[PDB]
Scaffold this active site. Structure first.
Site, mmCIF file in Angstrom:
data_model
loop_
_atom_site.group_PDB
_atom_site.id
_atom_site.type_symbol
_atom_site.label_atom_id
_atom_site.label_comp_id
_atom_site.label_asym_id
_atom_site.label_seq_id
_atom_site.Cartn_x
_atom_site.Cartn_y
_atom_site.Cartn_z
ATOM 1 N N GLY A 48 0.253 -1.644 -3.938
ATOM 2 C CA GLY A 48 1.392 -2.532 -3.973
ATOM 3 C C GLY A 48 2.240 -2.428 -2.729
ATOM 4 O O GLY A 48 2.611 -3.446 -2.147
ATOM 5 N N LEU A 49 2.540 -1.202 -2.304
ATOM 6 C CA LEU A 49 3.358 -1.020 -1.110
ATOM 7 C C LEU A 49 2.666 -1.577 0.123
ATOM 8 O O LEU A 49 3.294 -2.258 0.944
ATOM 9 C CB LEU A 49 3.674 0.460 -0.914
ATOM 10 C CG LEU A 49 4.159 0.833 0.485
ATOM 11 C CD1 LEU A 49 5.575 0.334 0.694
ATOM 12 C CD2 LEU A 49 4.073 2.333 0.711
ATOM 13 N N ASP A 53 6.837 11.487 1.186
ATOM 14 C CA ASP A 53 6.103 10.247 0.966
ATOM 15 C C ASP A 53 6.368 9.702 -0.427
ATOM 16 O O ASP A 53 6.574 8.501 -0.614
ATOM 17 C CB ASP A 53 4.607 10.485 1.178
ATOM 18 C CG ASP A 53 3.740 9.467 0.458
ATOM 19 O OD1 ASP A 53 4.014 8.254 0.569
ATOM 20 O OD2 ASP A 53 2.781 9.882 -0.224
ATOM 21 N N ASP A 89 -26.100 -4.735 -36.667
ATOM 22 C CA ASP A 89 -25.027 -3.778 -36.464
ATOM 23 C C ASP A 89 -25.375 -2.722 -35.432
ATOM 24 O O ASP A 89 -24.521 -1.889 -35.116
ATOM 25 C CB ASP A 89 -24.671 -3.114 -37.790
ATOM 26 C CG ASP A 89 -23.411 -3.675 -38.394
ATOM 27 O OD1 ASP A 89 -23.028 -4.802 -38.020
ATOM 28 O OD2 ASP A 89 -22.804 -2.996 -39.245
HETATM 29 C C1 PMR Z 1 2.231 10.118 10.157
HETATM 30 C C2 PMR Z 1 2.391 9.083 10.970
HETATM 31 C C3 PMR Z 1 2.916 7.829 10.415
HETATM 32 C C4 PMR Z 1 2.151 6.836 9.783
HETATM 33 C C5 PMR Z 1 0.673 6.917 9.501
HETATM 34 C C6 PMR Z 1 2.958 5.727 9.574
HETATM 35 C C7 PMR Z 1 2.814 4.629 8.748
HETATM 36 C C8 PMR Z 1 3.323 4.676 7.459
HETATM 37 N N1 PMR Z 1 4.431 5.429 7.313
HETATM 38 MG MG1 PMR Z 1 5.736 5.678 8.675
HETATM 39 N N2 PMR Z 1 4.192 6.349 9.568
HETATM 40 C C9 PMR Z 1 4.221 7.325 10.516
HETATM 41 C C10 PMR Z 1 5.179 7.188 11.506
HETATM 42 C C11 PMR Z 1 6.146 6.167 11.475
HETATM 43 N N3 PMR Z 1 6.217 5.290 10.471
HETATM 44 C C12 PMR Z 1 6.768 4.145 10.947
HETATM 45 C C13 PMR Z 1 7.015 3.010 10.172
HETATM 46 C C14 PMR Z 1 7.322 3.096 8.837
HETATM 47 C C15 PMR Z 1 8.415 3.019 7.996
HETATM 48 C C16 PMR Z 1 9.704 2.344 8.371
HETATM 49 C C17 PMR Z 1 8.007 3.341 6.691
HETATM 50 C C18 PMR Z 1 6.879 4.114 6.907
HETATM 51 C C19 PMR Z 1 6.219 4.754 5.914
HETATM 52 C C20 PMR Z 1 4.908 5.239 6.068
HETATM 53 C C21 PMR Z 1 3.684 5.044 5.283
HETATM 54 C C22 PMR Z 1 3.524 5.173 3.797
HETATM 55 C C23 PMR Z 1 3.016 6.587 3.542
HETATM 56 C C24 PMR Z 1 3.949 7.554 4.225
HETATM 57 O O1 PMR Z 1 3.739 7.899 5.410
HETATM 58 O O2 PMR Z 1 4.770 8.189 3.533
HETATM 59 C C25 PMR Z 1 2.682 4.746 6.165
HETATM 60 C C26 PMR Z 1 1.223 4.525 5.851
HETATM 61 C C27 PMR Z 1 6.806 3.982 4.739
HETATM 62 C C28 PMR Z 1 7.011 4.911 3.571
HETATM 63 O O3 PMR Z 1 6.523 6.058 3.625
HETATM 64 O O4 PMR Z 1 7.960 4.708 2.787
HETATM 65 C C29 PMR Z 1 7.709 4.046 1.473
HETATM 66 C C30 PMR Z 1 8.118 3.367 5.233
HETATM 67 O O5 PMR Z 1 8.781 2.582 4.594
HETATM 68 N N4 PMR Z 1 6.555 4.024 8.174
HETATM 69 C C31 PMR Z 1 7.490 4.524 12.157
HETATM 70 C C32 PMR Z 1 8.518 3.643 12.819
HETATM 71 C C33 PMR Z 1 8.250 3.495 14.313
HETATM 72 C C34 PMR Z 1 7.328 5.889 12.272
HETATM 73 C C35 PMR Z 1 8.040 6.851 13.187
#
Ligand code: PMR
Ligand code: PMR
Ligand SMILES: [Cu+2]
EC number: 1.3.7.7
Lengths: 400, 424, 431, 402
Positions: free
Chosen positions: B409-410, B274, B36
């Site tokens: 997941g995202l 975000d 145990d």
């Molecule tokens: C701060 C600069 C940055 C980063 C690191 C990314 C990637 C990324 N950007 Mg968004 N993103 C920024 C700019 C842009 N993102 C781009 C792409 C994209 C989209 C459509 C989306 C997104 C998002 C995000 C995300 C997830 C975290 C976030 O920034 O909120 C990353 C890492 C994501 C999200 O936040 O929603 C769930 C979302 O669906 N990025 C584009 C289109 C040209 C822009 C202007």
């Protein structure tokens, strides 16, 4: 020989952890209390999360204050589980400490369950309680349960009586067939299809050291024991292969040709792992009974000076083959209470301090480089090709 | 009789062992069968506590099933006194010696050891480790903690923290920081760092504080009468619970409710643009009752998660559990097997299930984002990094730990979306 | 020259913005084409700064004629003045603003700004974002800081932290805790929390502490020369480095080297039978040079990892890295492109790729455990929780964050090894 | 005049490369535009994307011919590493414009030198000319001249839209008795649609202004139809197309009756949180009015300031006609005034730029971050309630967190 003290070894049910891995069509219903349930939950670890065949039916208060109700209810729950698990063909009822104290007729229960279940599920019972067993001994008991049932074959066959992983048992069989005929029948059957023909002339090859009573049960069928030092290094493996070979008859030339590649395969690996073990003090505490074999191997090959090779259950007729290669220097003391060997460790500070898992972390904090023997039974290090891997496992020269 | 595969709770003697291993210098000697001692593994590995837990199982075998077990216990106690010199010592039995009655308390009195002995009556067949721990704590408080003068400074005792507890070690530090911040000094934390001297001093505080009701409600209730000590109810997991707790101990002590929230980033880090996909996600909280209730108060009120399930395994705490389940519009799953909760989430399919280790594993088996908040865990969930679960920093810890599965997941969802389209 | 899909560093003006937004009351009036605003998004979203980055953009949509662009820059300077009321102004040029002929400082002076205006030169085609941050720091130190009397209590300066740093916040909390627990107070953490007034007071601390060398070392050298403030060198990432740093700051301040190691869990936990499988695990180490060297010490000593390759992405600190690599029996891999990193990982086939965002993904594509130990990271790696890197609590963090991927692999590999994923092989005696 | 927050046109590349595959985009410029692509792609760059920056170091600054030779070498190297390319793009950037490194003549230089299988075209996402979504506009508008012509009534709705939604649209639209739809069955090859005098193009995404001009140059016929975002937009779009192509409305009422029901039901289900909330449509993507009409009418919203970087009234007039002329539009963009208007008006829902999103949300404003609607499916019926949902998300999250 605990001097009425704390014997750190586990109750035999922990062996079920790897037994269920070996016999993949075998279920193990344990009737232990919540303590034994927790033991299985913990010692199995990640086993629990993938549908393990580890029924730990806890006997609750209703099972107390009553005997016939208890085993009738057990019958009911078993039927329910085969309803949920039709794939199982051998159910392994196991005696638990609660089962022993309440005097549950595990044998009679297994008998009635087999009767109403038929040959489709050959439910077997054995004992794995801490009141009787100690860790590995559970595997001994579990295989001894099937021993009488196994078909009687008076023809000269070989029995691979051991639960080594496929990458170990298959290699053993391959080598044995490479030099000898190899009428090898693995007693821990992978499936019920490979029912081994145990018998009078079916001499059994014992490969796992902790198997003690196994000897008795198999010898009752007439199966003789080969006095072969246990296949666990350049000496144990070579001697075991040699003795198995001449027991069935193999020329020295054929043995040399067959074992020439493994010999050079393992000599370099063991040497390349031994420099971490070159000339240091060892200390085997009684966790699992592989320590005599480990001392036979490591002390003589990797130059680990043998201080004390503790053993919870010492044997004379089985341990003798590897006992011969054992030096007299190490203390052959049996398994004492934790205080005794712990004070011995403190006094005669050993470089490597093989012990139970419970003492591993404390002595590690107490300035003792420790290797837990618990890892040994799971890690496949019980043949020639893995002799170097075993030495590397024992090495553990972690620096900060 | 029931076929169990993963018991959420160990036997109660494990709980008594947890309390003993938590505090310093009290040897919980046991009448247990040989083998145990497996429980020592939990504390020595998952908690990585260095020294062997201060417990001495008698470890009786087929040789010992009569009065020899009583002699074993007699030896165990006298030995433990001399060899493992304690200031306080426990007695008790596991399942086997529970059936093979040996009058543990009578044996302990027969030795008549100068150090106090706490007789433990632990039903080891109908109760569980959370009980075991609470009962053991109560017995040692009634045996060692006697009423005495209030500390001139307003002071409180943290009751509830217990060795091998979900982030208990960090949570004491966080709550101590917060209580000192308000001004309250902590008189003696028990039973995670206390000593029998500290348990003797327990009564000297002005009001006990219940960090973990599971292991501390019995102690606090007994202290309410014996020591004339009110105890706070609101365990401070998350921002809202933290505010309520701050106000509560402020009222209890008499000091202003000022608490420094300059480390609170969760309100901002979840209100950010975000964290907008997180709104209205389905979650299945399971595990410890207090942890689950406070985690729900966070998930539905500071994160925007929509609670689609809820469940518990502390039957002892079913009543508040059910009350909260009504509070969120759900029905509490006060179960003790993985099958029920597994079927529940399969029917519910929440996006983020979280709870015991089982929740994580059958999340993975179901491919669902998985987090950990409750008690049953392995060595990984016991971290070396400072990760409390209460206070403001606890709120931040909850935030990050919960949305990490979501972020994984995202990101994986995107990666599969990208570099992949119709071939032609 | 090359097809850059991954660039570790950013343009110099981004580093200048890091420094600018790190401060409180400093506007970075930047000449830049319409669209170069994107970096405000990086700061706003990755780091989650509530207030918008205090930088203005003289966006010239299509009046690219020098007469116009100069007017836009001047107007933006003055507008940023009376709009945001900064205590000092930071003016520079970015990318095409370097291509367009402007006097980035002459106009700012010409507008007769009463608040000090710091002229910045950022060569936008031979430097990077780390340079830019460091140079902007050097400029603000020259303009604002001035030698004054030493404080009565030994005051240590936390030189180096900026915004959008790798854990540049929890880390300075941890270092301040260690330093003040020893007794030394901090005068002014200079970026990531320092008004221009704080920079004006940088000349009263006794001995500088170079937290993050890369962004702040040049300011440290200027401090040593002009302000006559010695600067410590070792970065306290880990336990060994932390002890060394504690001893060093003790000597520089003449105080006892007391260390609150009661929080130290990493030494004991690494020295545990639970985690002896670590010994003999090749780890690839990439990222900015400081973090990589410190991670080298930690991996080789505290964890027993055998380090297989150490590379960095900033050439500015190559020499220390090659020194260290020759120390560890390897050769440094100072590069700038992700391709050479991918090749190095592919050839060496590690088992733990501690590296920047890109190394994390290289790992995931290759199926190797990954971790982040450097600057280039997305929003995820900027956590809300207390996650420092230096100090003893930093050592604990390091331990868990580095071990967590390996445990993920192990329990993953176990669940594979287990009979649920292994009912495919069988043997029947002699087959 | 003033500080403009709109990004460069290279942000178009981010979705252009996915939507138009087998198309590599050399954004020749500085490390700065390189960083912009890096950050914007976010996680795409890991998934072996089809773009990249040809950095111009100081070496490739003074000598334009030297830069040209190096660019040709780079292009050859890429096509060797990427044989699957069918149309390389020499997209210019702000440094490239300043260096006046004419990529048009460069595209002529390396048209068929490394294989005629790569049809290298040139557009300019440079922030000095285009503004954000003007990138994809410019790319497709440069596509137009190389396109072949046709001699049939061909529906050239411009393929700047997700393939799933595009398949939905073409399915319904062909169901409405219409043939050539510029829907290449595999969609994985160069569509190469014919653009003749009888070609009829229907503007699908508003930002495609110069594409409209290019098709008009090719004698193609525009459809002045409200844009297919919500319910009335998509309905009027389909009805208009049906009329101009020659289809009656009788079959139309039956073809999209169920889709109309789903769109209206989903919008009614998602606008529950959206009850008379004020919307400040900040100029970010010039996409705003098309969303506005949807919000203000069929969602039940109250527009305040439907601004735009640029306004192409030639294709916006249809959409604006449904817009209530109360809400003002904005041709003047400067954050120095836009943020002040937002702060004074206190709109409950604002579509700020991403760099302004978090700051604006810190000032008690629910910010719909606008980069989604270009990137996420918000077109046609099935995806109208979705659009209303993303708009109702910020207010619901505010509601939960108070
Ligand atoms: C701060 C600069 C940055 C980063 C690191 C990314 C990637 C990324 N950007 Mg968004 N993103 C920024 C700019 C842009 N993102 C781009 C792409 C994209 C989209 C459509 C989306 C997104 C998002 C995000 C995300 C997830 C975290 C976030 O920034 O909120 C990353 C890492 C994501 C999200 O936040 O929603 C769930 C979302 O669906 N990025 C584009 C289109 C040209 C822009 C202007
Ligand atoms: C009964 C208590 C206990 C616990 C906590 C577990 C799980 C676990 N036991 Mg060890 N283990 C216990 C006992 C045993 N373990 C078992 C299994 C197992 C293995 C293969 C491993 C190990 C270990 C551990 C550990 C710590 C490391 C781990 O989680 O794997 C847990 C919690 C671990 C080790 O010893 O150190 C690396 C290791 O690799 N055990 C077995 C052998 C059949 C038994 C009897
Ligand atoms: Cu993870």
């Amino acid at each position: 020989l605990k001097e009425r003290g704390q014997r750190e070894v586990f109750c035999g049910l922990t062996g079920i952890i790897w037994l269920h891995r070996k016999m993949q069509d075998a279920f193990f219903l344990v009737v232990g209390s919540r303590t034994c349930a927790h033991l299985l939950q913990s010692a199995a670890g990640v086993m629990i999360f993938a549908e393990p065949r580890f029924g730990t039916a806890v006997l609750e208060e209703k099972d107390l204050a009553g005997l016939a109700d208890a085993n009738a209810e057990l019958d009911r729950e078993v039927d329910r589980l085969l309803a949920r698990r039709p794939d199982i063909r051998q159910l392994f009822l196991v005696g638990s400490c609660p089962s022993e104290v309440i005097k549950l007729d595990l044998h009679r229960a297994a008998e009635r369950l087999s009767a109403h279940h038929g040959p489709a599920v050959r439910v077997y019972n054995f004992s794995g309680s801490g009141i009787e067993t100690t860790f590995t001994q559970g595997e001994d008991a579990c295989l001894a349960s099937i021993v009488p049932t196994l078909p009687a074959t008076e023809a000269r066959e070989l029995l691979l009586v051991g639960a080594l992983p496929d990458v170990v048992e298959d290699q053993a069989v391959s080598l044995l067939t490479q030099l000898g005929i190899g009428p090898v029948r693995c007693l821990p059957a992978h499936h019920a299809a490979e029912a081994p023909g145990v018998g009078p002339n079916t001499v059994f090859a014992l490969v796992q050291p902790f198997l003690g009573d196994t000897h008795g049960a198999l010898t009752r069928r007439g199966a003789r024991h080969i006095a072969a030092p246990f296949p666990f290094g350049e000496e144990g493996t070579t001697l075991w292969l040699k003795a198995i070979a001449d027991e069935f008859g193999v020329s020295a030339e054929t043995f040399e040709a067959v074992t020439a590649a493994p010999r050079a395969r393992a000599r370099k690996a063991v040497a390349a792992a031994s420099e971490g073990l070159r000339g240091k003090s060892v200390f085997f505490l009684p966790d699992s009974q592989l320590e005599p074999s480990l001392a036979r191997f490591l002390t003589r090959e990797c130059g680990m000076s043998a201080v004390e090779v503790g053993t919870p259950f010492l044997h004379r007729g089985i341990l003798g083959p590897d006992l011969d290669l054992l030096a007299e220097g190490p203390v052959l003391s049996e398994g004492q209470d934790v205080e005794r060997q712990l004070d011995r460790v403190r006094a005669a500070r050993p470089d490597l301090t093989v012990c139970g898992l419970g003492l591993a972390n404390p002595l590690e904090a107490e300035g003792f480089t420790t290797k837990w023997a618990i890892e040994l039974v799971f890690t496949p290090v019980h043949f020639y090709e893995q002799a170097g891997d075993l030495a590397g496992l024992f090495s553990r020269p972690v620096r900060r | 009789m029931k076929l169990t595969l993963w018991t959420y709770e160990g036997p109660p003697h494990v709980g008594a062992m947890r309390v003993a291993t938590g505090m310093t210098g009290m040897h919980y000697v046991l009448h247990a069968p040989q083998g145990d001692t497996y429980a020592d593994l939990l504390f020595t590995m998952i908690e990585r506590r260095g020294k062997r837990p201060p417990v001495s199982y008698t470890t009786f075998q087929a040789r010992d099933l009569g009065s020899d077990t009583a002699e074993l216990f007699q030896s165990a106690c006298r030995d433990a006194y001399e060899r493992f010199q304690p200031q306080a010592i426990m007695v008790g039995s596991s399942c086997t010696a529970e059936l093979i009655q040996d009058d543990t308390g009578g044996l302990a009195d027969a030795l008549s050891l100068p150090v106090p002995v706490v007789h433990l009556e632990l039903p080891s067949y109908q109760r569980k480790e959370n009980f075991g721990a609470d009962e053991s704590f109560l017995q040692i408080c009634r045996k060692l903690a006697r009423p005495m003068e209030r500390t001139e400074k307003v002071s409180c005792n943290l009751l509830g923290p217990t060795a091998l507890g979900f982030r208990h070690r960090d949570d004491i530090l966080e709550v101590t920081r917060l209580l000192e911040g308000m001004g309250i000094a902590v008189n003696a934390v028990a039973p995670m760092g206390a000593s029998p001297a500290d348990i003797a001093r327990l009564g000297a505080a002005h009001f006990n504080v219940l960090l973990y009701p599971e292991t501390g409600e019995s102690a606090a209730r007994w202290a309410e009468k014996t020591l004339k000590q009110p105890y706070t109810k609101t365990v401070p997991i998350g921002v809202g619970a933290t505010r309520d707790f701050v106000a509560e101990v402020a009222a209890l002590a008499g000091v202003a409710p000022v608490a420094d929230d300059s480390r609170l980033r969760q309100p901002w880090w979840s209100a950010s643009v975000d964290s907008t996909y997180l709104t209205g996600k389905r979650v299945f909280l399971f595990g410890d009752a207090t942890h689950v209730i406070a985690a729900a108060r966070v998930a539905r009120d500071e994160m925007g998660f929509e609670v689609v399930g809820m469940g518990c395994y502390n039957r002892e705490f079913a009543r508040p559990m059910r009350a909260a389940a009504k509070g969120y519009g759900l029905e509490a799953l006060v179960t003790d097997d993985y099958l029920e909760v597994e079927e529940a989430i399969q029917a519910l399919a929440p996006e983020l299930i979280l709870g015991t280790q089982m929740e994580r594993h059958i999340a993975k088996r179901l491919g669902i984002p998985c987090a950990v908040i409750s008690a049953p865990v392995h060595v990984q969930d016991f971290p070396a990094r400072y990760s409390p679960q209460m206070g403001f920093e606890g709120a931040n810890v909850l935030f990050d730990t919960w949305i990490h599965p979501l972020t994984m997941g995202l990101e994986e969802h995107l990666l599969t979306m990208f570099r992949e389209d119709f071939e032609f």
